[model samples]
Target: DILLTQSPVILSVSPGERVSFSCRASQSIGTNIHWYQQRTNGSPRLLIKYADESIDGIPSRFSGSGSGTDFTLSINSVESEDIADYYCQQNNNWPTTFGAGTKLELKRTVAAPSVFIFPPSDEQLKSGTASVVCLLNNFYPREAKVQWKVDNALQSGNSQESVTEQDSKDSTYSLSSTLTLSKADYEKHKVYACEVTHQGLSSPVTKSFNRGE
Candidate 1:
């Protein structure tokens, strides 16, 4: 299988700055490399075909170079409207493969998310299981780490978390984590804490669930 590795999975750049993305092929595929651009709510469009060849209607600043195993996608000067994702594909062999993609975005300072927790439902608590949900909303830079702690000990299991873009147009993101525990543990007056660490915060943000009096 031919696997293409794209570098700088996320690239933040300012308008008017030059940028280049690398796409490496597992084996030599000559100039069969191609590039595409994808914007929000749109399909991918061919930008560079057959390595360095430019497609009609594409801006002159967008170009590709190299052959065989190594390829490059270059933008002479990034425009404000060019904030989107770029990917590379190979057509030299069967099972045409594609690069994971590179996100081209405007430079931004870190956006910290607001963390909140939902206590276990009365029904679940009565059924002997307490499921607490942690929500991290409006965070930026794409990723945040979430940890569940029962007092001082870290809790781990098949707990699940899902991430989604809070707003489709902006770069903000949201994450949800569910931690399930035994109702007996909750009644024991133990504290359940959700700790979140993101680039925007100097320290991790923690929200705790304490047993009600």
Candidate 2:
């Protein structure tokens, strides 16, 4: 897509900044055009049907509303480091109509991963084995790194800590990492922390927890 026939102007953004882009169709589509895009190096979705409404855990910035031959798609604050191609399409006609895809390149990284430290399990703590999970909730780019520290010393081993999940509803992604240690470490009153490094984040996300707190 170029200047004519309509295409969102290519954009570059900073994290936590509010920005928007859109897709337009030449004729009326009656709110039929759907938005599917790739951002943060990754945006995923599922199939079958078209509907409009905000989603849970889905950012409010992303929305679609238009009718009568011309349809519009837009995304609000660019929270995800999403970088890729996107297009609008509706299959009511004999030959499905998909507008030319929009291509985007990000000069500056965006989005700070929502990372959290879950409390240790009581049972696991009592069993001489303790486990703590780092929830890297709904973040983009997938190019994230995690580090575990026990009393400031780096950990060399842990449970499965690499997993990325795609939400079919929102075209977003989530990640998590877990660390386990001997209950004695907890008994020692040492601190346990998990740090996550993300694509757009200049500093890693750090979460620390103490005994039962």
Candidate 3:
């Protein structure tokens, strides 16, 4: 098994600043390294593949370089929309591995979002499935991260979906994610949690729904 080490852990930068981060592998993995950008409340998007190739639709400001055991991902000029986590992956080995990830945050902090977890409604319980909604409201910088866990395991698939919107009146961002599962699965699980990560907070905000509560 190979381990990828990412440096700095977190990089704080302002808009229009040039930035780069390092990803070193335990062994030489050639140019098999790839970079991905994970935005708040969004899926990870491929930025650079095969070490330095650009992907369609990605902006010209994003680029990558290096080979063998070391690699780098850089942005010529950072933008407000470019604030997100960057991850490096290697597919050259038997089991593809990824870096721990480097979070790109704004140098200036804003207000953190308030999080809430709404349990399945009584009306929803009448059906075979129920939905739990996690809402993050009134945060600045326009992007926030969210995740859901069932009994501490990350939940995925079509069972969960999220939506984000901005309030023009105050220019803050609000997001909501819904986790839907069958009644059988809900009864089998003991705890459900909604986790939110924003640039303003040093730690993630979490709210939970207990089965009996």
Best by lDDT: 1
RMSD of 1: 4.8
With a 3 Å backbone cut-off (N, CA, C), the pairs that clash in candidate 3 are none
Report model 2's TM-score to 2 decimal places. Answer: 0.47
When summed lDDT is taken over every stretch of 10 residues in candidate 2, the lowest stretch is: 44-53
Give the lDDT of residue 29 in candidate 3: 94
Per-residue lDDT tens digits of candidate 1, residues 121-165? Answer: 888898999889999998887779889988778888846899873
Across 106-157, the per-residue lDDT of candidate 3 in tens digits comes to: 5444878888899887778888887989888878776777788999999877
Q: What do the candidate models score in CA lDDT, each in turn?
A: 0.86, 0.61, 0.84
Could you tell me how far off, in angstroms, the CA of residue 27 lies in candidate 3 after the best superposition? Answer: 0.5
Choose 1 or 2, whichever is better by TM-score.
1
Error of 2 at 170 (Å): 2.8
Model 1 lDDT-worst window of ten: 164-173
Which candidate ranks first by TM-score, i.e. highest? 1
True-vs-predicted CA distance for residue 46, candidate 2, Å: 14
- Per-residue lDDT tens digits for candidate 2, residues 1-213, read 212133665655554565444555554455555566654345544111242555556556666666655555555555434555666676545466665666544433245678888867887777888777888876666578888887888887665576544433333456777787778776786678888888767877799987655
Candidate 1 residues lying further than 4 Å off, grouped into runs, are 1-16, 24-31, 37-45, 52-62, 66-70, 76-86, 92-107, 126-128, 141-169, 197-199, 202-204, 209-213
Q: How many backbone clashes does candidate 2 have?
A: 12
* Rank list by lDDT: 1, 3, 2
Query: Cα RMSD to native, each candidate?
Result: 4.8, 9.9, 10.2
Q: TM-score of model 1 relative to the true fold?
A: 0.62
